[PDB]
Amino acid sequence: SSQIRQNYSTEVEAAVNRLVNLYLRASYTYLSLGFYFDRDDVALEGVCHFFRELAEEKREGAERLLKMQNQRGGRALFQDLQKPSQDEWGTTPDAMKAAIVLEKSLNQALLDLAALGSAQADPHLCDFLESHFLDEEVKLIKKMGDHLTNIQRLVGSQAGLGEYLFERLTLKH
Amino acid sequence: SSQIRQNYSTEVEAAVNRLVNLYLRASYTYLSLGFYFDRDDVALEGVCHFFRELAEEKREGAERLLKMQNQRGGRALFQDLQKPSQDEWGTTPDAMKAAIVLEKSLNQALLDLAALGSAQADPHLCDFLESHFLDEEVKLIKKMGDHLTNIQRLVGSQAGLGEYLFERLTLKH
Amino acid sequence: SSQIRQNYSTEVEAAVNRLVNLYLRASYTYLSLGFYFDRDDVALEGVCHFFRELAEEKREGAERLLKMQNQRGGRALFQDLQKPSQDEWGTTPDAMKAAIVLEKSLNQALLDLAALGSAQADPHLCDFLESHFLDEEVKLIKKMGDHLTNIQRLVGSQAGLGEYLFERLTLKH
Amino acid sequence: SSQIRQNYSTEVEAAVNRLVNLYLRASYTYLSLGFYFDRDDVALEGVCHFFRELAEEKREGAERLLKMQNQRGGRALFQDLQKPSQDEWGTTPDAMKAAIVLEKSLNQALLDLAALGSAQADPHLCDFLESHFLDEEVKLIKKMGDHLTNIQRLVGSQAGLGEYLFERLTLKH
């Protein structure tokens, strides 16, 4: 039951639950990406840390959504978290490309929820999504695109050398 | 006169004045609630302080609206502030329920103004309302619902004991 | 490939992957438990925080296992994370009982891995499991049993009052 | 003579003496590796320091074993320290490979002693070996494998450039 629910549609409530699942799935994907780069036969620790920090960010996104669900008087419903799409993630550009695909899919889900909010005349969604979700997503995707461009520039020259240099000189330690 | 008014409809200007009256009326209601709980035959000071702090918040809301009215080149018009709906506010759950009804009515007024802003293509209202009003309202109502649930849980067990414990252990001192 | 794997059986490698899945599933279960207690019609925030902190601990356990998997030259393989067993978790004693069942199942999995390590003459597992896993589990289960005993003592007297008092006076804020 | 020896087999006592010799031999090998990289016609100082620090670690391991030998009432017996297997150590990947072979041989000796401890029902060996020896060895070998993977990635691109970059950007100064 809820004594507080007001102007909160069943459609939005369901979309929010779906988005929680998407963020948690993304977090899981990033966990797998991070540990792949920590393999002794891959050993690019800056990439390990980059993806692990993304896993944390996506889990935090999911938690923000769940907190909002309860604030509005909606009810969290969890579904299975499907395993990541790959067991091994190939080269650094392969992984960065996969990350961008993943982020674009999350962004589209956010765009769809924003549209739904407008269609349902639910202006709280405007405050909720605009900064911590939509703006963060635009910023993250820009950073990922920038990273992809740098690694592509580097591996065009020499692949092994390029991947090492990117990990040492772009990624944080 | 105004040398600055731009894209600010008479409808929005009027709605803003009405909302000022609603916030001030809410502030007045909370003043009465607070002092009721300070009666020597009620004597639940945590509840006194909870409602007095709400009275302050609602007055602050009204002042934010009036500042915005002037920023846009609209003109503040004040009306009588109707006395609160009750002279005595019953039990703690009675009062918390009354507070929630009051807050839901303010929230609906905010929702109506947000809708009007969209209908009038007045995007400044989006920035203005989203955080200090719509988000604050969602957060406040969640807190009130949580409080009501706790006091209901307690007075289901034993009323006197329950009201005392809630005031001592949930409410701030 | 691995250039480092030594004395690390395929059986242990598989068991470790299974245990990662179990820890992540437990983390997910605790996420659901925590948010259930944050519902406006439940509103027991000490219980919210207790389970959320457990969710963090279980995720940390999974990450420790994955780090060890790579240290040994094994290969992480992720599977679907099955949704928690319930959508709503009943009373505080209901939830604490469910937590204990969950923890006992993790503990049994740890016991099985310890046995396997001994059977495979893999003494690194002795150092790895003993403190951060086996000892932490014993300590956690003792705390949970203590909590269950306290809430049972309280709800035997008066249920609503008992659950409120436990949340206020035992659980951390 | 000893007035303290209890549950300490002659087999374990002998194995411990052998392991002291193995650690000291490893320390000696690392001394030679370090100074090879300090040759003016090699001049990779990060590699000098990496191997010198390993020489220190192995000597410390030997000293820990000797302290334990006396704590148990066993008697240290020293044998000749055979000279390292090479006078010159080739390329950085050549040396890193040689280090890994060396470490795997020490690890196997530790595994054998752990097995012997279990066979002799000598549980003090469990506490003694688990962290400072078995866990340290797993961690060290992971680091070495990671290093080998990075240098292999680099020298696959361009050997001279690769060895220089690894020394400058991976190894500590």
The domain in which residue D76 lies consists of 1-173
β partners of residue B13: none
The CATH number of residue A39's host domain is 1.20.1260.10
- Best probe of the A interface among B105, B142, B144, B148, by most A CBs < 10 A, is B142
CA distances (Å), origin C111, targets C15, C78, C125, C130, C134: 11, 21, 11, 10, 8
| B60 assigned ligand-binding residue | yes
**Closest Cβ–Cβ partner in B111, B135, B145 for A3:** B145
Contacts of B148 in chain A (CB under 8 A): 3
Instruction: State the total domains in chain C.
Output: 1
Cβ–Cβ gap A39/C70 under 8 Å:
yes
Nearest Cα to B136, choosing from B54, B67, B63?
B54
Neighbours of C, requiring at least 3 CB pairs below 8 Å, are A, B, D
Interatomic CA distance for residues A99 and B27, integer angstroms: 50
Contact residues on chain A for B104, CB-CB shorter than 8 A: 6
CA gyration radius, chain C: 18
d(CA C34, CA C44) in angstroms, rounded, equals: 10
Torsion angle of alpha carbons A51, A57, A58, A61, nearest 10°? Answer: -170
- Which whole-number Å values give the CA distances from C122 to C22, C72, C137, C144, D145, in the listed order? 22, 11, 21, 32, 20
To one decimal, the resolution in angstroms is 1.8
Give which of D29, D139, D40, D143 is closest to D95, Cα–Cα. Answer: D29
Rounded CA separation B150/C164 (Å): 7
Q: Which residues of A touch B100 (CB under 8 A)?
A: 3-4
**Count of pairs with CB atoms under 8 A, one residue in A, one in D:** 41
DSSP letter for each residue of C5-16: --S--HHHHHHH
Contact C7, C122 (CB under 8 A): yes
DSSP-assigned letter for residue C173: -
Beta-carbon contacts of residue B44 (< 8 Å; ≥ 6 apart): B37, B92, B163, B164, B167
Rounded to whole angstroms, the Cα distance separating D79 from C23 reads: 49
Q: Which residues of B14-35 are buried (b: 16+ CB within 10 A; e: fewer)?
A: ebbbebbbbbbbbbbbbbbbbe
What are the backbone dihedrals phi and psi of residue C5, each rounded to the nearest 5 degrees, phi first? -60, 130
Chain-centre distance for alpha carbon D11? 23
DSSP C82: P
Tokens found for residue D173: 């100064």
Is B63 flagged in the annotation as binding? yes
Query: Which of B:25-84 have CB within 8 Å of A?
Result: none
Method: X-ray
